[PDB]
């Protein structure tokens, strides 16, 4: 007996196109999403070129329209040069992404004043998300308060961070956050097995106490999102390993396992992979869209999942209970039992749908 | 220039059918909803007969299907006799309503043990909402914790209540709440004008300090809902005034006025009249459904709004800025500028839609 879920949304994926298509492209990354029970993705802007201006966004939009197999929105990236220049295209993006710790030189901000400039100039009704680790969470929260608006904190990974966000919420501040599966299901205890190359990710894997704090503070977590960050095994195992894990195909099986063990409820899962993504990012419903999962099937994660071009996974060897059996996207069978059945280009930019524009005052 | 909003949801309305149709019926109450920019309502079970068993729910469902002009879900009501008897029909209802203070004899619970019995027997994945005032909020929160599930608190009206819920949320407890417009826009200061009959409502009007606490603690409020409780003027002004105010036609104009004054944002409003109702009650999207509002039009609330059979309003004389101009429901023009244009019976029970079933484990 299968369980029907709504179309799940992953608000944090790196699909590598343009410019890193050996790691992933729109067609392969969205196949991975569908196989993971995800029907809508928000793609990050740290591509090559990065999505930091209108011409780059226009290119990326067409590449996604031609390659995506599920629906999507594309983030714009903040740079040291583009504050005050994005107003005409801002509403066509998923939101604005700030990279406040390590990142590409093009996305590096060298001063908190540049963060303030972005918060002041980006349209106040549109989402802002920040990669902000440790004290950077508190710093960007300060900037958000100074500019009197909200912020969403990406991939919270530490006890320190979840407790700071908890304290901010207790003071009524408009902050939301997401947590990625590797920070719930992996820890320092796994670095022996992974090694220092495969294990490289930002935010880094936490201690057992960090992991336990995130579970204990599940009420504080608004969203789950994969931070799908595909790199090939050659890159992960080489001399200058880039940070990041692939995660689209494993996120839902890992979380369904946790549901089956009573660690969180099915509703808790659906708030975090459907309702809260919708409401934080003003993402539209998808008509005639659902995911059917089998909650009894026990399997072991293999050395690579079928679809992501990353061709490796840090969850290799973990036993899961829960599998995606069928995905229907806008009335078409998109995935059944290991086969993707919609072509590249089936997916659409949800920000172009009438219901996908963010409401604003005239 | 109009603003397009999604279809708004009111999770707390009394539509009086069956048995009180001189006060309101499905056709008139849903006309009032459409004129207020509401496209989906959840109707309470304190009708005559009350919706406390499967035959009563079946009757109410058919009356609503025949009379409703917007979409709906119907609550079941907890009684002293029905715990453990509602499992076959529970998933067809909006949720279970507990009346924990004053109410009809049929819905009166005489012991907290009866509350526990309902929390233990009602399916754990389905919503429970409680009319719970003052210390009753703390009591029902205790019952929810003892039974390890969530609860939604109706019409929070007092500083005491919002601060208790605030403290519960700070401890990570699964509680949500709603606030009605009369508790944000009226206070004791208005009882002189209203008089003791018209002014009767439960929860009663608060002090200025209660009102100010609700605004200061807007972050704690998950939903707005009208508690549309129509009674005729003869009843409100007579010897045994029933509590309650009509509110469907005035809720959105009052709140749009507050948005225009900067008291909350458009997003704050839409979280509370759209996204959070959806996610707390697992209500489905409505395809091709939107509301167009004019934010510049200043008007004064008259002695009665056009549609509710209550034929009076406690907001008479208040100046508002904001008006509903057009509602489209599932591809049909449902309301324009003072005229409802869909007939009785256009509305549908959203719990019968495939996307309107609450997900559950097998
Ligand atoms: O911040 C980031 C970005 C990401 C990437 O590879 O794009 N991978 C990571 O591990 N952290
Ligand atoms: O609890 C309630 C119910 C309602 C009604 O009239 O049905 N009116 C009120 O004022 N409070
Ligand atoms: Zn990041
Ligand atoms: Zn993120
Ligand atoms: Zn990322
Ligand atoms: Zn929205
Ligand atoms: Zn009530
Ligand atoms: Zn209620
Ligand atoms: Zn009520
Ligand atoms: Zn739901």
UniProtKB/Swiss-Prot annotation, chains A, B:
Location of N6-carboxylysine modifications: 97
Which domain of life does the protein's organism represent? Answer: Eukaryota
Per the entry, what induces it?
A: Transcriptionally repressed following hypoxia by HIF1A.
Subcellular compartments: Cytoplasm; Nucleus
Annotated region DHOase (dihydroorotase): the residues are 1-329
Q: Where does Zn(2+) 3 bind?
A: 97, 131, 155
Indicate which residues the UniProt annotation says bind Zn(2+) 2.
Answer: 12, 154, 178
In this chain, (S)-dihydroorotate is annotated as bound at: 16, 46, 202, 231, 243
According to the record, mutating residue 12 to N results in: Abolishes dihydroorotase activity
Result, substituting residue 178 to T: Abolishes dihydroorotase activity
**Entry binding sites for Zn(2+) 1:** 12, 14, 97, 227
Could you say what the effect of mutating residue 12 to A is? No zinc-binding and no catalytic activity
- Modified how: Activated by MAP kinase (Erk1/2) phosphorylation just prior to the S phase of the cell cycle, when the demand for pyrimidine nucleotides is greatest, and down-regulated as the cells emerge from S phase by protein kinase A (PKA) phosphorylation.
User: What other comment is given for this protein?
Assistant: GATase (glutamine amidotransferase) and CPSase (carbamoyl phosphate synthase) form together the glutamine-dependent CPSase (GD-CPSase) (EC 6.3.5.5).
What does this protein's UniProt record list under function? Answer: Multifunctional protein that encodes the first 3 enzymatic activities of the de novo pyrimidine pathway: carbamoylphosphate synthetase (CPSase; EC 6.3.5.5), aspartate transcarbamylase (ATCase; EC 2.1.3.2) and dihydroorotase (DHOase; EC 3.5.2.3). The CPSase-function is accomplished in 2 steps, by a glutamine-dependent amidotransferase activity (GATase) that binds and cleaves glutamine to produce ammonia, followed by an ammonium-dependent carbamoyl phosphate synthetase, which reacts with the ammonia, hydrogencarbonate and ATP to form carbamoyl phosphate.
Subunit record text: Homohexamer. Interacts with CIPC.
Q: Which family does it belong to?
A: In the N-terminal section; belongs to the CarA family.
Q: What is this protein called?
A: Multifunctional protein CAD
Q: What is the organism field in this record?
A: Homo sapiens
The record's gene field reads CAD
